[PDB]
């Protein structure tokens, strides 16, 4: 779908109200043909997704939005779908070209530092100025009176623009101020590479750069191109999320590059004083980080890639490179941020229908799709791989559930099959399937500050992003004519994550790293820094707090949460360790809190509940000295979309 | 627009129970069926996934007619093959309506083996298991987070065979935990489908010789309150007749000396008259005030408008009907043209025009051009005191005679007589009882919705909403009385009439100890007779939990409580005595917000974080939780509550 225009806001001796042009029925079927021929008029358009609202911004004939709401979408127009003429995710600002009618607000330049916001209820709210981004509310209103505002013009007193509204910086539920993309980062944007060449690794510098390189999996970007820096004499470490992978390219370099490259791994480690070392990112964090002048250029591979292992081990590279002698970081990947994903010329792409013997997520798989040959199907839960495996199975089809926890021997690796896994998959296994049928959904991990006393740390499944399909599809195709079969054309925007993923990274320094707080935060900071890397809201110093508070955790119910393997390791065993400490019971007695089974005879009375990682059970107090830290840590200033 | 099946949920026909779902309706598909109302494609199975365009849930065809819930469905229509089927039942009491179901659907049967091993199939095609509880209740054998059930409702409980036992309503929920399932029973359905599906409810009830309750559906015009109760009273019977509006019951007394002859009693604040006729009017504040039903007073009691959903008419109706036979009454009448689960139709008197974008004034998203209003005399209602004020402003400088009237302002400042665009709130409803040339309307309203929050116990928030049935057709009812009249509309959308918040249970409560001295036993007492009574509003049983809540709310400041009261404000009681915890503890309550406004005063001594009891708007300072009456609500919050899925 395109986004569309729904309304307009009509501005004035400041005044504004709102004109709806669409209603449902309009908007969806304009959003699918893109072909939108209703008069526009204004500087202020209210814009819809199916999913969402908020709104546009006209100025210098580009009508801007941002990049969390429209994602890398195209703008239904008179003449069809209208392509964006920016994105520029790492200002959470996008740009289509004004249609015709379409009036745009110049610049503010006097400068004024008494600034008014327009919502989509055409409100115009005082808001003074403090920094180049952002700005206080006269008077604090509840964070839900700014949602659908997104896009909305911040005006000067004159009438102009000094930019569009993006987040507000909430207290505890109630918005004290605004963040929002200045007008001079729109000129900016205005001026930047129509197509910036990527797929050229860079040669290396005098002195310390970090380069992009965008190229796909197949392409040599970590194979070709580390033999080439190493045949120049350079020593190189790449970095990849996967184990599999990992371990993969040493097999592989021997007998295509003639090296034998030093391998790391949680799992195994293989010097051979080779110029080229390929590591995890989780094995690189367990090393210490950089090694002091070993290497002169690192790859981070994959570096879309949005587990927290992933984030916390390129903002260590980042912080840590230039220190350690090293002269390039190149951070590669074949899907950036903003990206969508295009025809495959090797991949014929089918959507699955309602006919055939399997159900799948509403419709249906023909069994003469998967009966011969080897067939990879995601789906986005453990439970959902089980059953189908198991449905599978009973009609006597070759069908093997994978999934993380599982042993990847479950395979087979030759012969029929129908493999239906997770995207554990992605991580565990290297091969390639004859198709790929694709629920095109997933399960994450979302952050909810919920106040029921502190945060709550939810799983939900949602829609696939650009990044999701591309690298599911790709399973298919390489080296052989593949077929993608799909539950639905839908795709989220790609290259943004969780603050929650942020949270995982304090707990994975915690739990693994020995990092204090403080250090992930440096880290983590240089991450931020980066332009060009996936985006995220700064809640940096809200984390640092919350696990700066909790300390003296138990070291034998740390051991047990690590070796289970799931996920929040440390909070969940130090919950634990202030349910065992307090001789309460914890919140539920779900398999997350099994390390306190042998005391459940001893444990009594409500649960000292610290925050929300599933379904509380037991009645709850708040009394406990840590609960009450993290109530307080509360109060810190959070930056939430509108 | 009708519901429109967008999938279904195959059950296995042997075996151990399991379903998969098939999706056969898009986002577009299902918009478009829902205008059309026809609905081309072939149904199969039992299960069927629908959705309206607010929500989705599930139906569920049992002996040839497809089941759901009222609180998903309304009164809507389902789109079918030859266009919308009407509903063959609406079964508002039960949360239970019903369409005959179309060709291409298969039908579950009821259960023979009377098993109390239950199956729960979902949207998403689990199968949860369940212990039969009671005749409509059943356990969780894994009690699981309330989210993984909504959407859910509609759908079937199953006994072994595959049978059905019931359809799915609502969770019955333990802080935010889903531990057990309330369900609409198979034999509800059955002694449905053997009883009539018209009930005639058209003309006042004769008399019967001992107590009974009856209801009036009738137009408005049909003389409810002034024809009926006249009628009665020729017959010597003495009758008592209560409405919810000051303006109203002094109106239909004065109808009535003109009229019908007769002097009657008037019971309001601002007017009481004993003449000794066998007629009394009142409001229904009043009949609290007075301390309900005077023992061997009345023969007949009419309640009138009994489709309110105000905390006074309920906790007045409640009050009736556990009274009025004890008090040796024969007849209580439950009158309104307005039922639960009524629609609005067309009028003939009133010509009907969607409002467009052509016009000089700004209408919510819409346009009324001057012409519509220039002259004579029109009503336009807003959803906010605010939107009044500034319609009036933007209407009196276009040379417009415009007078804004909402709760608080008085009547008299709306000409009688002249030319006149009065902007109103629905306090016009019960403050004043003129007709228009016209009428605007935004069809949209304000409400209070009570949101569980644990943060740290609930949240009353004031949110906007979509008009139903009920108060589009009393919005409309101010033109076209006796002669033409327009009516003017933003939208055609109308959400189901007759259902009620749980905030309006606390609000009789509330009520209940701020003015007519009940202690929440005896506001429980009244209430319960309210649920108990069939073809009345509906809500969920909430009473429990909120008798518990107010139980613990003792030794309010009296001088606070006196001042929001008069005030006028909603929830009185709630108020002051966050106002009470804070003045007491000598901390700021929770923002400077005019709800506050009885601490102004005290603001040089106060400091330190609020003592949070709850959440009535925004918080803005720092707050604890050490408080003992915040411990108490947040014990009470461990209660057994019933939410929709
Ligand atoms: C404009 C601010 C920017 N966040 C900064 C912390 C920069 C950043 O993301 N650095 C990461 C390294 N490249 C930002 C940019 C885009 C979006 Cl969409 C933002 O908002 C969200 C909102 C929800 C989830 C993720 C990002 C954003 F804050
Ligand atoms: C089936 C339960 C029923 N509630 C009982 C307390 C009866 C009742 O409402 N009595 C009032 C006087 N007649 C019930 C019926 C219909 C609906 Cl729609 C129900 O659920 C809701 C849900 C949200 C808001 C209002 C009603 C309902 F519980």
Same mark, same amino acid.
């Given at each position: 779908?395109?986004?569309?225009?729904?309304?307009?806001?009509?501005?004035?001796?400041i005044?504004?109200?709102?004109?709806?042009?669409?209603?449902?029925?309009?908007?969806?079927?304009?959003?699918?043909?893109?072909?939108? !021929?209703?008069?526009?008029?204004?500087?202020?358009?209210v814009?819809?997704?199916?999913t969402?609202?908020?709104?546009?911004?006209?100025?210098?004939?580009?009508?801007?939005?941002?990049?969390?709401?429209?994602?890398?979408?195209? *703008?239904?127009?008179?003449?069809?779908? +209208?392509?964006?003429?920016?994105?520029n995710?790492?200002?959470d600002?996008?740009?289509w070209?004004?249609?015709?009618?379409a009036?745009?607000?110049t610049p503010?330049?006097?400068?004024?530092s008494?600034?008014?916001?327009?919502?989509?209820?055409?409100?115009?709210?005082?808001?003074?100025? $403090?920094?180049?981004?952002?700005?206080?509310?006269?008077?604090?209103?509840?964070?839900?009176?700014?949602?659908?505002?997104?896009?909305?013009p911040?005006?000067?007193?004159?009438?102009?623009?000094?930019?569009?509204?993006?987040?507000?910086?909430?207290?505890?539920?109630?918005?004290?101020a605004?963040?929002?993309?200045?007008?001079?980062?729109?000129?900016?944007?205005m001026?930047?590479?129509?197509?910036?060449?990527?797929?050229?690794?860079?040669?290396?510098?005098?002195?310390?750069?970090?380069?992009?390189?965008?190229?796909?999996?197949?392409?040599?970007?970590? %194979?070709?191109?580390?033999?080439?820096?190493?045949?120049?004499?350079?020593?190189?470490?790449?970095?990849?999320?996967? @184990?599999?992978?990992?371990?993969?390219?040493?097999?592989?370099?021997?007998?295509?590059?003639?090296?034998?490259?030093? +391998?790391? %791994?949680?799992?195994?480690?293989?010097?051979?004083?080779?110029?080229?070392?390929?590591?995890?990112?989780g094995?690189? &964090?367990?090393?210490?980080?950089?090694?002091?002048?070993?290497?002169? +250029?690192?790859?981070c591979?994959?570096?879309?890639?949005?587990?927290?292992?992933?984030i &916390?081990?390129?903002?260590?590279v980042?912080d840590?490179?230039?220190?350690?002698?090293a002269?390039?970081?190149?951070?590669?990947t074949?899907?950036?941020?903003?990206?969508?994903?295009?025809?495959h010329?090797?991949?014929?792409?089918?959507?699955?229908?309602?006919?055939?013997?399997?159900?799948?997520?509403?419709?249906?798989?023909?069994?003469?799709?998967?009966?011969?040959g080897?067939?990879?199907i995601?789906?986005?839960?453990? !439970? !959902?791989?089980?059953e189908?495996?198991?449905?599978?199975?009973?009609?006597?089809?070759?069908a093997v559930?994978?999934?993380?926890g599982?042993?990847?021997?479950?395979?087979?690796? +030759?012969?029929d099959?129908?493999?239906?896994?997770?995207?554990?998959?992605?991580?565990?296994?290297?091969?390639?399937?004859?198709?790929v049928?694709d629920?095109?959904?997933?399960? %994450?991990? %979302? @952050?909810?500050?919920?106040?029921?006393?502190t945060?709550?740390?939810?799983?939900?499944?949602?829609?696939?992003?650009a990044?999701?399909?591309?690298?599911? $599809?790709?399973?298919?195709?390489?080296?052989?004519?593949?077929?993608? /079969?799909?539950?639905?054309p839908?795709? /989220?925007?790609?290259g943004?994550?969780?603050?929650?993923?942020?949270?995982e990274?304090?707990?994975?320094?915690?739990?693994?790293?020995?990092?204090?707080?403080?250090?992930?935060? @440096?880290?983590?900071?240089?991450?931020?820094?980066?332009?060009?890397?996936?985006?995220?809201?700064?809640?940096?110093?809200?984390?640092?707090?919350?696990?700066?508070?909790?300390?003296?955790?138990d070291?034998?119910?740390?051991?047990?949460?690590?070796?289970?393997?799931?996920?929040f390791?440390?909070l969940?065993?130090?919950?634990?360790?202030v349910?065992? /400490?307090?001789?309460?019971?914890?919140?539920?007695?779900?398999?997350?809190?099994?390390?306190?089974?042998?005391? !459940?005879?001893?444990?009594?009375?409500?649960?000292? *509940?610290?925050?929300?990682?599933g379904?509380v059970?037991?009645?709850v107090? *708040?009394?406990?000295?840590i609960?009450?830290?993290?109530?307080?840590?509360?109060?810190?200033?959070?930056?939430?979309?509108?």
């Amino acid at each position: 779908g395109s986004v569309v225009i729904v309304g307009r806001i009509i501005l004035s001796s400041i005044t504004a109200y709102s004109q709806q042009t669409r209603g449902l029925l309009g908007c969806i079927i304009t959003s699918l043909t893109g072909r939108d !021929k209703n008069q526009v008029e204004g500087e202020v358009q209210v814009v819809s997704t199916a999913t969402q609202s908020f709104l546009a911004t006209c100025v210098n004939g580009v009508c801007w939005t941002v990049y969390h709401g429209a994602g890398s979408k195209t *703008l239904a127009g008179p003449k069809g779908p +209208i392509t964006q003429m920016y994105t520029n995710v790492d200002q959470d600002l996008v740009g289509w070209q004004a249609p015709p009618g379409a009036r745009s607000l110049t610049p503010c330049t006097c400068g004024s530092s008494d600034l008014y916001l327009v919502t989509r209820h055409a409100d115009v709210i005082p808001v003074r100025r $403090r920094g180049d981004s952002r700005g206080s509310l006269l008077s604090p209103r509840p964070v839900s009176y700014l949602k659908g505002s997104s896009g909305g013009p911040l005006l000067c007193p004159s009438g102009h623009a000094v930019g569009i509204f993006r987040a507000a910086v909430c207290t505890r539920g109630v918005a004290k101020a605004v963040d929002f993309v200045p007008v001079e980062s729109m000129e900016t944007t205005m001026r930047s590479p129509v197509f910036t060449d990527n797929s050229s690794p860079p040669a290396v510098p005098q002195s310390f750069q970090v380069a992009h390189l965008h190229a796909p999996t197949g392409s040599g970007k970590s %194979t070709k191109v580390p033999a080439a820096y190493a045949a120049q004499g350079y020593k190189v470490l790449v970095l990849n999320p996967s @184990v599999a992978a990992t371990l993969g390219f040493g097999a592989y370099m021997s007998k295509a590059h003639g090296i034998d490259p030093n +391998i790391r %791994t949680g799992v195994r480690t293989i010097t051979t004083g080779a110029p080229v070392t390929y590591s995890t990112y989780g094995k690189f &964090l367990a090393d210490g980080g950089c090694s002091g002048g070993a290497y002169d +250029i690192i790859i981070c591979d994959e570096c879309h890639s949005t587990d927290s292992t992933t984030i &916390l081990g390129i903002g260590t590279v980042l912080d840590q490179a230039e220190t350690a002698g090293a002269r390039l970081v190149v951070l590669a990947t074949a899907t950036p941020p903003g990206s969508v994903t295009v025809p495959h010329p090797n991949i014929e792409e089918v959507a699955l229908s309602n006919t055939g013997e399997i159900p799948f997520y509403g419709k249906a798989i023909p069994i003469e799709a998967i009966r011969g040959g080897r067939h990879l199907i995601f789906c986005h839960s453990k !439970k !959902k791989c089980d059953e189908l495996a198991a449905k599978l199975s009973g009609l006597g089809i070759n069908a093997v559930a994978y999934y993380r926890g599982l042993d990847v021997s479950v395979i087979p690796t +030759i012969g029929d099959v129908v493999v239906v896994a997770t995207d554990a998959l992605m991580t565990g296994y290297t091969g390639d399937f004859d198709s790929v049928i694709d629920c095109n959904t997933c399960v %994450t991990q %979302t @952050v909810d500050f919920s106040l029921d006393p502190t945060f709550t740390i939810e799983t939900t499944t949602v829609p696939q992003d650009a990044v999701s399909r591309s690298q599911r $599809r790709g399973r298919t195709g390489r080296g052989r004519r593949g077929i993608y /079969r799909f539950v639905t054309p839908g795709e /989220r925007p790609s290259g943004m994550f969780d603050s929650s993923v942020l949270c995982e990274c304090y707990d994975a320094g915690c739990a693994w790293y020995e990092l204090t707080p403080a250090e992930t935060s @440096v880290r983590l900071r240089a991450y931020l820094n980066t332009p060009g890397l996936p985006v995220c809201q700064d809640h940096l110093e809200f984390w640092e707090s919350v696990f700066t508070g909790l300390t003296h955790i138990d070291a034998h119910f740390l051991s047990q949460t690590k070796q289970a393997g799931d996920n929040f390791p440390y909070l969940v065993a130090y919950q634990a360790t202030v349910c065992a /400490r307090a001789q309460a019971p914890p919140p539920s007695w779900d398999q997350m809190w099994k390390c306190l089974i042998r005391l !459940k005879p001893t444990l009594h009375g409500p649960t000292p *509940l610290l925050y929300r990682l599933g379904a509380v059970q037991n009645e709850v107090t *708040l009394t406990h000295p840590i609960t009450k830290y993290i109530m307080a840590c509360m109060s810190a200033d959070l930056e939430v979309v509108t």
